[PDB]
Amino acid sequence: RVDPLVVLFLAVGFIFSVVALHVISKVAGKLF
Amino acid sequence: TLEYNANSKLITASDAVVALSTETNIDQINVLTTSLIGETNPNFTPQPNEALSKMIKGLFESGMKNLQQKKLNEALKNVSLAIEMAQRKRAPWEAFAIQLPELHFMLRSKIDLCLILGKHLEALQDLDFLLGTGLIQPDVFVRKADCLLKLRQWEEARATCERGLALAPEDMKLRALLIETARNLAEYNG
Amino acid sequence: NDAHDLYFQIKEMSENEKIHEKVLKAALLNRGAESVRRSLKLKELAPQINLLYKNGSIGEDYWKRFETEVKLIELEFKDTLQEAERLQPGWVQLFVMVCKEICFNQALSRRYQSILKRKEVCIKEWELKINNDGR
Amino acid sequence: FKPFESFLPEVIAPERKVPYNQKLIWTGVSLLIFLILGQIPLYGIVSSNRGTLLELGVSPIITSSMIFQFLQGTQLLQIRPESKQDRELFQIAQKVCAIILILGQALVVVMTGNYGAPLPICLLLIFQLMFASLIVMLLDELLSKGYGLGSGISLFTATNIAEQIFWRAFAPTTVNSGRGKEFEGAVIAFFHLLAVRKDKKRALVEAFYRTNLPNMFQVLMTVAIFLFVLYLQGFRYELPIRSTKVRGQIGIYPIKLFYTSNTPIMLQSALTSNIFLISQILIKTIVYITFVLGSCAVFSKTWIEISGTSPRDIAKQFKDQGMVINGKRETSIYRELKKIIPTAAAFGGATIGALSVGSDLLGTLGSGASILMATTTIYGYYEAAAKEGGF
Amino acid sequence: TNYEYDEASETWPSFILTGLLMVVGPMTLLQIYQFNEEVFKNLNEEYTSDEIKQFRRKFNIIIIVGWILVAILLQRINSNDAQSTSHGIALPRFLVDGSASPLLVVCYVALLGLILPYFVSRWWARTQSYTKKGIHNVTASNFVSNLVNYKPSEIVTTDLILHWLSFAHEFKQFFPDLQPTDFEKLLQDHINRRDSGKLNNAKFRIVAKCHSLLHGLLDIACGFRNLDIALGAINTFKCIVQAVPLTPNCQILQLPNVDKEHFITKTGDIHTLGKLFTLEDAKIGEVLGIKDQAKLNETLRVASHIPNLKIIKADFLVPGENQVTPSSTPYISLKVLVRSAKQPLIPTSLIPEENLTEPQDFESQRDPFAMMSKQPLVPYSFAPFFPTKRRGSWCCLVSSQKDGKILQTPIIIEKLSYKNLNDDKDFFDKRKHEKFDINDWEIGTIKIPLGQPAPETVGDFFFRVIVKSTDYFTTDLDITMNMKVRD
Amino acid sequence: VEFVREGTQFLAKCKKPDLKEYTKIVKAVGIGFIAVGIIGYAIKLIHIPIRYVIV
């Protein structure tokens, strides 16, 4: 069903979301 | 872009550089239309016209009578005229299993007469058509290898004569033509 | 590279040029014969294309385009049959047999007409310098 | 129990055979994605491969596969032998069992584990870990269908324990216990102590062998056992085979020395780790080495019949395909095959057991079973590259 | 705090010392630790024109950088002066804790989410484009598109394959400015030896890619089962590499410096290199028209060293079983005797029979193609007008005779021993049998796999295996032979 | 005693690989192993400041 580059994009965007969520938490802890 | 004369009922093309695929289709609709005019039937049938085939057979037998009188040039003219009649005026829905064997029969007679006459290249190209259509038989390869030896290309003649032995290796003339081709190709190389 | 649109051109010309019924009927047989020729050529060429695809030379995009062409030529022949059915009553079934037959006979006529061109190319290629008789 | 309505995510199988130039790079990219997903921590964790997105990791994929291979060896599932649709339905059942086991094991790790019971953060945690394990399992399928070199579970455990080897060899992480700054890495501390401290003969002797942290001598013994396993994982007993149904097709059926391919000694290690907890609650070196040798030999000969590569079964496969041994009779293929296969597999169990004993005595950075599992995986990749043709 | 990051700088040079030296040192050990005779490699550069050589011209550092880094860094380490277990890592404090920390997280996130997906996707598109035989996807689709609608009406020429070949997309990627109708005229000017204008560089790069494009077209057409396009394709490959148009006396137009109009005018009887060597060494200059002694020696030295094949014991073999049987997998096993158009008719009976029969040892007959693989490579072809230095290659293709088609993928081989050609046997000329060792004359082996198995029915069946010389218009080999299937 | 003799009888005919074979096996498998170790070790090394900063 799923192309392999779609799997690669899903994984990289997933890990990017996990990083950016910690970054949002750290910036919100530093500012507020 | 195409417009035609309604009186002749004949589709012609405009004054442009037409592609070959477009030109052949217009010419085929032209011959198919002038056959369908002569069909004169509401529903027309795959079985062939007997009177037209009888006229073609009679015009071919005229060339046979010229062949019996040792008049080879008029025989070649009459056989080529009969083949042009059977290719042009015959309907495309005339019976394929009676059109193609009649065409191969008259054509084999044409090539057999034309090789004796001396016009080798016409016989070669016509026999290459007869081979490519699918008759394939050693009696074709005898005349084809003989003609390739007569017009002095031995490398194609060797492959043609080996394909001739490749149908019936017990053929007597094909082995002699193989020896002839190898002997003259030894002069070609060495 | 086909005569599919060429029947449609005569069809559009029919609305203004008061063309003959036999001409518009006979132009349909050419698209039918081209459809039967491409259908049989498609069916006999499908194993070699599949062998090139499994071997790895031809590419996946052409294989998808090839399957699309199979479905498209089947739909086109189904369209031609409907065009013949609307064109004449009681003519839809014998059309297929006449269609296959003029397909084979039309291919034979092209292969026979090309021999003069092949003979001229042969003279240019092998340098015979032939006379009016054979040399 | 076979029919199921499949609307589950599954990667497309390639119609064209994928070349080795893509099979190497997709194994590399899949490995890189797997490990970069491994080393990253979660969002939901509040309290100060555990505590990461692989908190359960490959273990549900291994668990569902082990359960369904146990059921297939039980023959309770009664799978069709040649039906591709029934094998696909078995793979769909393995997929569904894997997804359910992922969600259940993840819910157990969330509610029971150290993350704490306090709730939208908990929902984000469970969806986070579930989607991470889902994309690891789908990446395993992407390696398994033919895009990578194959056997994504074996690839992941081989690369993980090779990473354990290179981490114990090259750790930058320094530990100072009274004496001074010492590196957990072996050769890191070797170059550091030969660069900094005076009396470099004493520093050379100290950095060569020291019982606190992993040695450079242990790294040299690791390289020596690595090269010895690479020489030992050849030893193909080439018997000649001659086909009879299609005449004149001549090849060789190879018999590796590691005929069981590193399966019995991990079961032996599990049995050893289980019996030590029982015997403690309730001369030795010679009994230990002969126990490892004899036990791994007996485990090899028992795993012969269970695995399905028995001399009777491979003789049935020869009589089904029609390949006799060259210059020998018809029943002679089974006579010679029973002469070769059980002795070869039991001796392969003896060699892998002696390799594990040499790894434990010499003090290798990893287990000999671990290094041998990594080398069997990469050597199978080399065998596939030699069959297809590789760069 | 779990880790400490060594703010006193006593540690972070020492880790990167090993991390640099373990990369450098084996590369230093690698770099410090670091059959056939070609005649035409010397003579090719003397007749290749200056424009082609200018085109060919137009189209250890890291180690010493590492050691200079090691010296400065070890000086910095030596410059330094020097229970509760406290874990720490080697990486420095400012790299992690200070103001470089948002810089590092931005560089990491950008490096991951850009450098992996963009480069992996561009690489995946680039690898998905080019097929297994080295040609682009849409040019393969373009070949099959022009080759399916090829009706058998028009005979294949040397111009029609150029007309198919100019539509390749790999020429459009090199030069997007101009149309493929100009590409066809440019290849026509390359064949017809015409001086082009501004795009003379374009012509040479187009021919250099036309090599692989004609191999791709040959593979597509020959797997397609249409023999005439494949045979004409190899003829156009000869035509493009030797840069002479297809003519019945092309075999001596491929010679380096002949007077073309003079030879066409004066003597038309001499078509073959073998018939060219019938005349004497002094007499050949007046016929070939060049009339320069060093040039005559150069032409005769090139015309000696062209390869001409000739079969000895061409038949089928089944590996392991001496008799061909139904439903078996035979392989084509023909043994060529490579000649020079100067060696008159080595008889088959004088072959000492020890090298004709393949040895029936199991290590040999497991895969018979290894004995072919042990043969040396074909040396550099003569052809100066083809831009790159070119390995001569032999391509073969079988033919089922009853259909007139091909039945399998064409096998392209470059493993032959041309020590039959060299100056050690220069005595043996066409213009007898005395003082020559027959074991010195080396017979090559051409073992070709048959793509289909042997058929199920018993009966005499015929295949036609031809081999053709790429990069040469020599005396090619075209034979038919039987498979006496007997069960 | 008997099994060891039959095992070395098997190993005498076991086709021990030659040095030219062993060199290719090492140059493929061990270099792929070291490449695996480097590709892994770079990730675990880079992710420790990542785990301290990003947390």
Swiss-Prot record, chain A:
Top-rank lineage group of the source organism: Eukaryota
Localization per record: Endoplasmic reticulum membrane
Record-annotated membrane-spanning stretches: 4-24
Membership in a protein family: Belongs to the SEC61-beta family.
Subunit structure: Component of the heterotrimeric Sec61 complex, which is composed of SSH1, SBH1 and SSS1. Presumably three to four Sec61 heterotrimers assemble into an oligomeric ring with a central aqueous pore. In cotranslational ER import, the pore diameter varies from 9-15 A in a ribosome-free resting state to 40-60 A in a functional state when associated with the ribosome. The Sec61 complex is part of a channel-forming translocon complex whose composition seem to change dependent upon different functional states.
Role summary: Part of the Sec61 complex, which is the major component of a channel-forming translocon complex that mediates protein translocation across the endoplasmic reticulum (ER). The functional states of the translocon complex include co- and post-translational ER import, cotranslational membrane protein integration and retrograde transport of misfolded proteins out of the ER. In the cotranslational pathway, ribosomes synthesizing presecretory proteins are targeted to the translocon by the cytosolic signal recognition particle (SRP) and its ER-localized receptor.
The protein's name in its UniProt record: Protein transport protein SBH1
Underlying gene: SBH1
Full protein segment contained here: 51 to 82 of 82
Curated annotation (Swiss-Prot), chain B:
Chief location category: cytoplasm
GO molecular function, one term: protein transmembrane transporter activity
Subcellular location per the Swiss-Prot or TrEMBL entry: Cytoplasm
SMART domains referenced in this protein's UniProt entry, alphabetically: TPR
UniProt entry keywords in alphabetical sequence: Cytoplasm, Protein transport, Transport
One Gene Ontology cellular component annotation held by this UniProt entry: Sec62/Sec63 complex
A GO BP entry: post-translational protein targeting to membrane, translocation
Role this protein plays: Acts as a non-essential component of the Sec62/63 complex which is involved in SRP-independent post-translational translocation across the endoplasmic reticulum (ER) and functions together with the Sec61 complex and KAR2 in a channel-forming translocon complex. A cycle of assembly and disassembly of Sec62/63 complex from SEC61 may govern the activity of the translocon.
Subunit comment: Component of the heterotetrameric Sec62/63complex composed of SEC62, SEC63, SEC71 and SEC72. The Sec62/63 complex associates with the Sec61 complex to form the Sec complex. May interact with protein YLR301W. Part of a complex consisting of KAR2, SEC63, SEC66 and SEC72.
Note: Present with 5290 molecules/cell in log phase SD medium.
Protein name: Translocation protein SEC72
Native source organism of the sequence: Saccharomyces cerevisiae (strain ATCC 204508 / S288c) (Baker's yeast)
From Swiss-Prot, chain D:
GO-annotated cellular components: endoplasmic reticulum; rough endoplasmic reticulum membrane; Sec61 translocon complex; translocon complex
Any one GO molecular-function label of the UniProt entry: ribosome binding
Main function: Part of the Sec61 complex, which is the major component of a channel-forming translocon complex that mediates protein translocation across the endoplasmic reticulum (ER). The functional states of the translocon complex include co- and post-translational ER import, cotranslational membrane protein integration and retrograde transport of misfolded proteins out of the ER. In the cotranslational pathway, ribosomes synthesizing presecretory proteins are targeted to the translocon by the cytosolic signal recognition particle (SRP) and its ER-localized receptor.
Further remarks about this protein from its record: Present with 24800 molecules/cell in log phase SD medium.
Matching NCBIfam families: 3a0501s007, PRK08568.1-5
Similarity-based family: Belongs to the SecY/SEC61-alpha family.
Protein name: Protein transport protein SEC61
Species assigned in the record: Saccharomyces cerevisiae (strain ATCC 204508 / S288c)
Gene name of this polypeptide: SEC61
UniProtKB/Swiss-Prot annotation, chain E:
Subcellular localization(s) per the UniProt record: Endoplasmic reticulum membrane; Nucleus membrane; Nucleus inner membrane
Annotated Gene Ontology cellular component terms: endoplasmic reticulum; mitochondrion; nuclear inner membrane; rough endoplasmic reticulum membrane; Sec62/Sec63 complex; translocon complex
Keyword match Membrane: yes
Sequence ranges of the Sequence repeats: 342-352, 374-384
Modification(s) after translation: Phosphotylated by casein kinase II.
TM stretches of this protein: 12-34, 60-75, 102-120
Cytoplasmic compartment segments: 121-487
Function: Acts as a component of the Sec62/63 complex which is involved in SRP-independent post-translational translocation across the endoplasmic reticulum (ER) and functions together with the Sec61 complex and KAR2 in a channel-forming translocon complex. A cycle of assembly and disassembly of Sec62/63 complex from SEC61 may govern the activity of the translocon. SEC63 may affect SEC1-polypeptide interactions by increasing the affinity of targeting pathways for SEC61 and/or by modifying SEC61 to allow more efficient polypeptide interaction.
Protein's name according to its UniProt entry: Protein translocation protein SEC63
Reported effect, residue 384 to A: Temperature-sensitive
Entry's Gene Ontology molecular function annotations: protein transmembrane transporter activity
Keyword hit for Repeat: yes
Lumenal-side positions: 1-11
Residue ranges constituting the SEC63 domain according to the UniProt record: 109-413
Alphabetical list of CDD domains matching this protein: DnaJ (cd06257)
Membrane-related topology note: Multi-pass membrane protein
Other comments on record: Present with 17700 molecules/cell in log phase SD medium.
Modification Phosphoserine occurs at: 393
Region feature (2 X 11 AA repeats): 342-384
Gene from which this protein is expressed: SEC63
Keywords per UniProt: Chaperone, Endoplasmic reticulum, Membrane, Nucleus, Phosphoprotein, Protein transport, Repeat, Transmembrane, Transmembrane helix, Transport
Pfam families for the chain: DnaJ
